[PDB]
Structure 1
Amino acid sequence: AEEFPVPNGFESAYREVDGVKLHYVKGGQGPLVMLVHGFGQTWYEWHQLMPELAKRFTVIAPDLPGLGQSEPPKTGYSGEQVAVYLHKLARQFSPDRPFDLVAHDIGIWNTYPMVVKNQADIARLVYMEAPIPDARIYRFPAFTAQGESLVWHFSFFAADDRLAETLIAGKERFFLEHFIKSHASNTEVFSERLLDLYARSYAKPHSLNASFEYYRALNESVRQNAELAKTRLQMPTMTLAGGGHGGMGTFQLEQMKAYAEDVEGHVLPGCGHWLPEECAAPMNRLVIDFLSRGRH
């Protein structure tokens, strides 16, 4: 069974990595690019970008541990722990050559440690729409002069007593529509049909719980990254961020400059957090062009 429609010419498969069965969708030929989704979503956010990339690359899009059709991690949900699964997965398909990485939202949290610890394995890097976990996150406001802030949910999701699961169970579809639209500029792309697909996936009890465990591990990931960040990333990197409602704006690039020697950033006007869906045409173009500067 498949929670989301696989693009024509792609395969949906699973790979056991350190005792954890990871789901992925794969297609294309050439050097490997791994695309890693974020919260509220699955590999499917990449489905419009994938066929295009697959003309020039071998493309893999896994589900994060516990999310989509992937088993929960057995170690834990901190960025360093999860990154091990993603690194080993990628290296199964690219054992003797470096691969490209594109990551959105908590996909960043879950890949940053494997990038910094295995720099020679990463040819080119694209990060969009989430802070790398560090002390900067403790500066984001709980509340703004415009109303609900960007990251108040960090505390909601991290709260003890399974507060978030207890409140959200049974109302996953309602909550996700609010969460996604509140972080979007172009809300119109989130049709009821699309929201139904995403909500059905994260409503699996283990997936709802897994989603929040990433936030419950956030302070641990910050602590991990404080050590790792002592060495800057050396490979070509690009950041994207939305400039519209719900987007990270100039923060994405400004933070990355502290982490990378070689970085170019773009802020996409009229787009919020959900770049692949809100602004598919310019986002896809930026990613393809950036990755195509290397071998393909």
Structure 2
Amino acid sequence: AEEFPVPNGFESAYREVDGVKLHYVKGGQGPLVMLVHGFGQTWYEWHQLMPELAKRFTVIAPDLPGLGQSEPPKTGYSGEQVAVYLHKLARQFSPDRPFDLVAHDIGIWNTYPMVVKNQADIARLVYMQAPIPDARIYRFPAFTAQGESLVWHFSFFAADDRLAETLIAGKERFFLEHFIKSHASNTEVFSERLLDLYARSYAKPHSLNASFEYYRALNESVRQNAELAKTRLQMPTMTLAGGGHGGMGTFQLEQMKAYAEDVEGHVLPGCGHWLPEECAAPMNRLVIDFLSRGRHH
């Protein structure tokens, strides 16, 4: 069974990594690019970008542990723990050469530690729409002069007593539509049909729980990154952020400048959080061009 339709010429497959069965979709030829999705979604957020990248790269898009069709992690959900799975997965397909990385939302949290600990393995890096977990997140406001802030879900999802699963179970499709659209500028790309696909996936009980365990580990990830950040990233990096409702605006680049020696950033107007879907044409162009500066098929 497949939760989302595989683009023509791609394969849906699984690979056991440290006892955890990870789902991924792979296609193309050439140097490897790994694309890592975020909360509320799966590999499928990349499905429009993947055929274009596969003209020049081998493309792999895994489901994060516990999400999509991937088994939950056996170690834990902190960034350093999850990054081991993703690093080992990528290195199975690119054992002798560095690979490229594109990551969205908590995909950043789940890859930053393996990037900084294995810098020679990462040729080029693209990060979009999430802070790297550090002390800056403790200053984000709970409430804004416009109304509800974009990050109160940090506390909701991290709350104990399984608060979020208990309130959202049985209402997953309602919650996800509200959550996605509230973080979007171009909301009407989120058709009922597309929302149905995403909601059915994260409504699996272990996936609903996995979704929130990433946030229950957020403070641990901050503590991990306080040590890791003592070494700046040396590879070429690009940040993308939405400029519209739901977008991180200038924060994405400004934080990354503290982490990376070589970074360029873009803010996409009229685009919110969900860049691959809200603003596919400019986002895909920016990613393809940036990765194509390095060698490719």
What TM-score do you get using the length of structure 2 for normalisation? 1.00
Q: Distance in 2 between matches of 1:150 and 1:111?
A: 22
Q: Report the Cα offset of residue 113 of structure 1.
A: 0.1
Q: Distance in 2 between matches of 1:47 and 1:288?
A: 14
1:166 corresponding residue in structure 2: 166
Q: Report the Cα offset of residue 11 of structure 1.
A: 0.0
Indicate the RMSD between aligned Cα atoms, in angstroms.
0.3
Q: Distance in 2 between matches of 1:97 and 1:115?
A: 14
Q: Distance in 2 between matches of 1:81 and 1:64?
A: 12
Query: What count of residue pairs does the alignment treat as equivalent?
Result: 296
1:82-115 CA-to-partner distances (Å, cap 9, x unmatched) read 0000000000000000000000000000000000
Structure 1 stretches of 4+ moved >4 Å: none
Q: Report the Cα offset of residue 182 of structure 1.
A: 0.2
Structure 2 unaligned regions, length at least 5: none
Q: Distance in 2 between matches of 1:162 and 1:128?
A: 29
1:6-55 CA-to-partner distances (Å, cap 9, x unmatched) read 00000000000000000000000000000000000000000000000000
1:145-181 CA-to-partner distances (Å, cap 9, x unmatched) read 0011010000000000000000000000000000000
SS of residue paired to 2:245: coil
Q: Distance in 2 between matches of 1:294 and 1:172?
A: 41
Q: Report the Cα offset of residue 262 of structure 1.
A: 0.1
Q: Report the Cα offset of residue 129 of structure 1.
A: 0.2
SS of residue paired to 1:264: strand
1:170-208 CA-to-partner distances (Å, cap 9, x unmatched) read 000000000000000000100000000000000000000
1:125-162 CA-to-partner distances (Å, cap 9, x unmatched) read 00000000000000000000001101000000000000
1:180 corresponding residue in structure 2: 180
What TM-score do you get using the length of structure 1 for normalisation? 1.00
Q: Report the Cα offset of residue 288 of structure 1.
A: 0.1
Q: Distance in 2 between matches of 1:82 and 1:141?
A: 28
2:40 corresponding residue in structure 1: 40
Identical counterparts, % of pairs: 100
Q: Report the Cα offset of residue 267 of structure 1.
A: 0.1
Q: Report the Cα offset of residue 225 of structure 1.
A: 0.1
Structure 1 unaligned regions, length at least 5: none
Q: Distance in 2 between matches of 1:141 and 1:241?
A: 19
Q: Distance in 2 between matches of 1:248 and 1:44?
A: 22
1:110 corresponding residue in structure 2: 110
1:224-267 CA-to-partner distances (Å, cap 9, x unmatched) read 00000000000000000000001000000000000000000000
Q: Distance in 1 between matches of 2:216 and 2:292?
A: 37
SS of residue paired to 1:257: helix
